[PDB]
Design a protein around this nucleic acid. Structure first.
Lengths: 131, 182, 118, 263, 77, 329, 38
RNA sequence: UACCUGGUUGAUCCUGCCAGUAGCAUAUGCUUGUCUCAAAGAUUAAGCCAUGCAUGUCUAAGUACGCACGGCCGGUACAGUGAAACUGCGAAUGGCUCAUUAAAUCAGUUAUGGUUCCUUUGGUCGCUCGCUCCUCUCCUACUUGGAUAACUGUGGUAAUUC
RNA sequence: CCUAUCAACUUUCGAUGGUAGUCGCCGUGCCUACCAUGGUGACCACGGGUGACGGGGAAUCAGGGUUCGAUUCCGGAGAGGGAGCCUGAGAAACGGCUACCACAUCCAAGGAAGGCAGCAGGCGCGCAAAUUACCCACUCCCGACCCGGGGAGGUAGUGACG
């Protein structure tokens, strides 16, 4: 309600093909309308659709009535996918990282050391203990 | 990283006359305890030592000039010191009171919605004012000159205007549950 | 205890073994392991003697001479193929190459020859 | 122990003038091996994402570099922590902007856009001028570029316009009294000025009396003086903060006056 | 090492020995043979020191030292 | 079937016995605690702590109010089942080598070895309950024949003793004063176990000469022979179907640093009337030392040298399937 | 535990829960062994 | 914040130490609501150690004959992708702890004209200057020689990253 | 830094120097021949002691001073103790090796494999000090590399040091 997105520190970034900016959202008394709302709202300003817009940061300001965050708008989805930090993709789901996770890989790596050749053998050796 | 105390403990623990003096300051300026008084004692002693050092430096010396002016400017910004005086000699003459008087609590007394040096502190701590459009919850604060021109009710205390919390609504339901009988 | 060349005697000794020697397998560069190795001259305490027939006689033994296990890997060097047909290296190897089909590798069969170097 | 050289450098142990933070990050970028020494260098990353702010992760920095849109000294780099130094030109080919690094007299590396005309060449002072093997002469510049068959009248502390299109010497400027210099390092960091007199002392360490534009006079060691061209004839412009020398009082007056007066 | 102690009383337990053998270095553990069918502390104990120096020092001193009006006997286990 | 693993013993199992109300499993090991487990839901009922040494054998009465234990500490104890407290101790001058309830449950046999203070014989203790305390005490000793007995069990109607011998003899005793009625020589190594059928006319034998035999009680002929490649440490007849379940012995074991992934010791099911294997059920990590059957045959339990007890829950599918050749005839 | 399994925890699934599956599949016919071995 | 005050006696003035007193750094006692910052197995055993894990690595691009997977696309060597293995590099760095050592370590200031240095960055990349051209005959240049892995098969060992 | 209840010390297994050579990445008594008889001390040497790592730094003091520094950073040193070595530009390396010594482990008795002063954890010790957790997204490091791996490091938990 009664937001307005005011863009400090605007950057035309031609070499990562994106408009990079701070998002300053005034509110009447309660800090922060949704991240999804902000991407939609911003989307019709620069006319790029919200699906090439990512928004991150965000931290409510005491006594309400403001929230400063950060946004990026990619000219195309290809550009977004190519600068691409995993956490940014994660933030509103559409890709998340590995879920193997971690100690499975370490066990596997220790199995490979034992013998020379025979890939499949070491997989099966890692797989029998669950313990 | 690094941390430091903001108060100082004197070398005599019982010194009756001084204890009375400190209690009087607490009464006058609405403070929590002796630690509040000690907090100002620590700051004031450092200011006087700063001043005294500068004053024994040679005149027309970059270090004395630059840091002198800075010390003066800071003390005038917070309205402790006046710039019709404005040198080292006068800074020495300042005392504990002069700081306390420029606090947020004592301004909230002098204008606005406090009735006492009691009331004021509780009002600040319960977020009844904004200094500008910015809530301040700390009564020991020290406001600057042009920050005393913007002390006013908050929009998160719902008298003086603001969204209903649950304390206004509590009073409403002493008329609709106290006197509504349900 | 594995046998190797040059240990000699009928005894068993532990020798410090380095790369390019039998009875040791590398596990880090500059690493050498002192391992037991069994004399090159046979006693009788062997679990298995590895014997190789070099000349056959005239009379078959079932699982070795009757039965036959081939191998599919041909030469990947140019000139061993060239030598075997006496065909000039001014005209390279030329189609004679040992290509083996691997059937149903995808949903179709392949025919693969190694990618010759030299 | 200590069985060999470190491949890491911690932050809060890196040189001040790179303008990194205190303890909020536990590792500094660290320069790669290259033509300049690591103290005086400015890793590519600090320029790219801390001054020009094109990345907010390290993941992005690697991805930027692999585009190969960045040439440094006319040649195509892809190193994440390139050891750029004094009068090294960075060429962004995607935007047509050439930036060179030259000290403020504050002591902070300047973001100093230059025209692509001035990014054709850079002036490099000779460090040694070497009679090489089989009687072929070479000059060697500070930035470790060896150019064979150099002009046959040159002598030590001359500057040399190196060209970055084609390499090699593209004339030279002779070392003489009153030449422009920028005094680099020490307590005289980023000051510009003439010479006046170079005092010579036999044996190690010879000091060069410099007079700056303001008329403040000082000496420094010859090592700390870098010759940047011919007297009263710049070939690149002065950077921000004067680049000469300014007092802490004057500097405060500028800081307060310009702020809340722009926008 | 491990040292054996003998001529313990039934009024001498692990706790009474624990403070006794601290001037000869810190004990790692004190095992004490108990049988509750007959008596309490049988008469033999096995004190285990962590370090070889500390163990030997004990054997030397404690043998001839009185504790609860008896001459304790200590010797290598 | 689905087997699950019950852990609560840290030492090799020595004897498993079901009660006759089919809802408790008693298991004992070389631990100074016995464990009692539900065999209908797998929850632990409790433990019996108070033993000073290894308890070799446990057995539960018909009522399910008393358990009796045989000890190598030279005692027989009566424990009150429903409080977990020992209610009577009798000191014995010899260890208990075998214990077995009679089918009327008011007498129990304890086998007292040739060595120690008591001589070779199967002593019979009357279980007489005056008041709330069941009292055990002997009033007969049946003297052994031949070489020393190793095992003993009750033959038909509990009026005979069938005994297994160190020599490898199976002897029949007319149990009221002894002695030999008939005997057969049919094993050349120690008979480890002999338990009786539920039709009370045949019994099953186990021996470390790797034979298990289905044996006629009253004639002492081998009816059927079950030959296993590993030795057999115990054998039981499994009701609910006409199989026998045998379990043992030594097979390859090569690491002592892993004991949770060397599962390769099985209990074998043989069909009683055809001598044909109907299953091998792996899961044990060391030799099976004891096999015990549920009195309704809806579970069987095997105890391992690994030191754990697996309780096995049959499904309807198991009871209804059988090898084709046996069905045909 | 000092002794038994009736202290400190009570008997039950306080002392009969495992962190590794001990439940395995067997056939109901005769190929119980073959299923494990493969 | 440049301070002292209490105790020798009948009383008094001195010499004097003792005790009080504040800082602080650990320990410990007792108590403890909300907000932020974080030092933390040094002392004493640089004692001893179960288990888990802390260094690995592929670009269109050194080297694919996977039991691979997928193709129509097949011969000159032919595949797109690719477990593996060889090759090259890291593994000396990192992290940890302060036992050891008294001009030793180390700090600051100097040196290597006394020496070694992968890599990166910049130069240096046809030739025997024709053996007074074997290199026009030394005529393999449209390119030489032959063996190991992974692989396939047989295996040994109570137990080994054998 | 402390010590004279340490006043003479250094070479017969070089102590100092000359000369020449062996040797070493390279200087050099580094080592060796021959030849000299030096070198050092009351300005504390020599010897002994040391919870003696060094610095940047820390705490308190009117000023003067006094006390602290294993401990977020820099240098050096060691990875159970000793000795030797391989690889590599760089290691006398314990998540390399080899021997012995002190410790510990498996064993079928023939053998075989090992080093938490790494991160967690346990035992011992004590007045004294935390999760057997989650993650490579950040910060950087390594590699053939944007792509992978990281108890580097981040993150939470424990936390009235403060």
């Amino acid at each position: 309600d009664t937001v307005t997105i005011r863009t400090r520190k605007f950057m035309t970034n031609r070499l990562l093909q994106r408009k990079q900016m701070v998002i300053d959202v005034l509110h009447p008394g309660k800090a922060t309308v949704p991240k999804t709302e902000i991407q939609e709202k911003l989307a019709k300003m620069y006319k790029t659709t919200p699906d090439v817009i990512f928004v991150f940061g965000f931290r409510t300001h005491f006594g309400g009535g403001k929230t400063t965050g950060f946004g990026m708008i990619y000219d195309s989805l290809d550009y977004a996918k190519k600068n691409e930090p995993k956490h940014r993709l994660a933030r509103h789901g559409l890709y998340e990282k590995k879920k193997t996770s971690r100690k499975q890989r370490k066990e596997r790596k220790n199995r490979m050391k034992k013998v020379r050749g025979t890939a499949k053998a070491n997989v099966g050796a890692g797989k029998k203990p669950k313990e | 990283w690094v941390c430091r105390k903001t108060y100082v403990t004197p070398r005599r623990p019982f010194e009756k006359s001084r204890l009375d003096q400190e209690l009087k300051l607490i009464g006058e300026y609405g403070l929590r305890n002796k630690r509040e008084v000690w907090r100002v004692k620590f700051t004031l002693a450092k200011i006087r030592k700063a001043a005294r050092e500068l004053l024994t430096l040679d005149e027309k010396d970059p270090r004395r000039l630059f840091e002198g002016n800075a010390l003066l400017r800071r003390l005038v910004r917070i309205g402790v010191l006046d710039e019709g005086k404005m040198k080292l000699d006068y800074i020495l003459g300042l005392k504990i009171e002069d700081f306390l008087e420029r606090r947020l609590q004592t301004q909230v007394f002098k204008l606005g919605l406090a009735k006492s040096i009691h009331h004021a502190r509780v009002l600040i701590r319960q977020r009844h004012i904004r200094v500008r459009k910015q809530v301040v919850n700390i009564p020991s604060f020290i406001v600057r000159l042009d920050s005393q021109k913007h002390i006013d009710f908050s929009l998160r205390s719902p008298y003086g205007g603001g969204r209903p919390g649950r304390v206004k609504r509590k009073n409403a339901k002493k008329g609709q549950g106290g006197a509504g009988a349900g | 205890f594995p046998m190797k060349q040059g240990v000699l005697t009928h005894g068993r000794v532990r020798l410090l073994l380095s790369k390019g020697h039998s009875c040791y397998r590398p596990r880090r560069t500059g690493e050498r392991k002192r391992k037991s190795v069994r004399g090159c001259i046979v006693d009788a305490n062997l679990s298995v003697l590895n014997l190789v027939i070099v000349k056959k006689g005239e009379k078959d033994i079932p699982g070795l001479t009757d039965t036959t296990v081939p191998r599919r890997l041909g030469p990947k060097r140019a000139s061993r193929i060239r030598k075997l047909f006496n065909l000039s290296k001014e005209d390279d190897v030329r189609q004679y190459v040992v290509r083996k089909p691997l059937n149903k590798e995808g949903k179709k069969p392949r025919t693969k020859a190694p990618k010759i170097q030299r | 122990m200590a069985r060999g050289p470190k491949k890491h450098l911690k932050r809060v142990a890196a040189p001040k003038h790179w303008m990194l933070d205190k303890l909020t990050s536990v590792f500094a970028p660290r320069p790669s091996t290259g033509p300049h020494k690591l103290r005086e260098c400015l890793p590519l990353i600090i320029f790219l994402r801390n001054k020009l702010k094109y990345a907010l992760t390290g993941d992005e920095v690697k991805k930027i570099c692999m585009q190969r849109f960045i040439k440094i000294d006319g040649k195509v780099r892809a190193d994440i922590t390139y050891p750029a130094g004094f009068m090294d030109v960075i060429s962004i080919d995607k935007t047509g902007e050439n930036f060179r690094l030259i000290y403020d007299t504050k002591g902070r590396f300047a973001v100093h856009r230059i025209t692509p005309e001035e990014a054709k060449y850079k002036l490099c002072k000779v460090r040694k001028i070497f009679v090489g093997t089989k009687g072929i002469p070479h000059l060697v510049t500070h930035d470790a570029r060896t150019i064979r068959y150099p002009d046959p009248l040159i002598k030590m502390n001359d500057t040399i316009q190196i060209d970055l299109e084609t390499g090699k010497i593209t004339d030279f400027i002779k070392f003489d009294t009153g030449n422009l210099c920028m005094v680099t390092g020490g307590a005289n960091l980023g000051r510009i000025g003439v010479i006046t007199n170079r005092e010579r002392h036999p044996g190690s360490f010879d000091v060069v009396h410099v007079k700056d534009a303001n008329g403040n006079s000082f000496a420094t060691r010859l090592s700390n003086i870098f010759v940047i061209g011919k007297g009263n004839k710049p070939w690149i412009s002065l950077p921000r903060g004067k680049g000469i020398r300014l007092t802490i009082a004057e500097e405060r007056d500028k800081r307060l006056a310009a702020k809340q007066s722009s926008g | 090492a491990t040292i054996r102690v003998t001529n313990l009383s039934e009024d001498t337990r692990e706790t009474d020995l624990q403070e006794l053998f601290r001037p000869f270095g810190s004990i790692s553990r004190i095992y004490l043979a108990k049988d509750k069918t007959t008596g309490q502390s049988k008469g033999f104990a096995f004190i285990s020191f962590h370090r070889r120096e500390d163990a030997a020092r004990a054997i030397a001193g404690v043998s001839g030292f009185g504790y609860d009006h008896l001459i304790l006997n200590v010797e290598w286990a | 079937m689905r087997p699950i693993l019950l852990q609560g013993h840290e030492r090799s199992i020595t004897q498993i016995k079901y009660n006759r109300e089919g809802d408790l499993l008693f298991t004992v090991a070389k631990d100074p605690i016995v464990n009692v487990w539900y065999s209908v839901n797998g929850e632990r009922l409790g433990t019996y702590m108070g033993h000073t040494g290894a308890v070799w054998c446990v057995d539960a009465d018909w009522d399910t109010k008393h358990v009796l234990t045989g000890s190598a500490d030279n005692s027989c104890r009566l424990w009150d089942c429903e409080t977990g407290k020992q209610l009577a101790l009798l000191k014995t001058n010899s260890a208990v080598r075998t214990c077995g309830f009679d089918f009327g449950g008011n007498i129990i046999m304890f086998s007292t070895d040739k060595q120690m203070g008591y001589q070779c014989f199967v002593s019979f203790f009357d279980l007489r309950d005056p008041s709330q305390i069941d009292n055990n005490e002997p009033y007969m000793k049946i003297p052994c024949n031949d070489s020393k007995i190793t095992s003993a069990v009750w033959g038909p109607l509990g009026e005979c003793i069938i005994a297994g011998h160190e020599s490898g003899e199976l002897n029949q005793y007319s149990a009221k004063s002894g002695e030999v009625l008939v005997n057969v020589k049919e094993h050349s190594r120690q008979i480890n176990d002999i338990q009786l059928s539920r039709e009370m006319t045949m019994f099953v034998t186990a021996s470390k000469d790797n034979t298990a035999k289905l044996f006629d009680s009253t004639t002492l002929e081998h009816q059927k022979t079950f030959r296993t490649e590993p030795p057999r440490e115990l054998a039981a007849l499994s009701p609910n179907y006409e199989h026998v379940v045998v379990g043992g012995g030594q097979e390859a074991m090569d690491v002592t640093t892993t004991s949770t992934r060397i599962g390769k010791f099985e209990a074998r099911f043989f069909h009683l009337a055809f001598e044909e294997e109907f299953g091998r059920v792996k899961g044990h990590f060391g030799p099976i030392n004891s096999v015990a059957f549920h009195p309704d045959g809806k579970s069987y339990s095997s105890g391992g040298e690994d030191g754990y007890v697996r309780i096995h829950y049959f499904d309807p599918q198991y009871f209804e399937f059988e090898f084709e050749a046996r069905e045909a005839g | 535990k000092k002794f038994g399994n009736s202290e400190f925890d009570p008997p039950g699934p306080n002392v009969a829960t495992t962190t590794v599956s001990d439940d395995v599949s067997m056939t109901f016919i005769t190929s119980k062994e073959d299923l494990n071995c493969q």
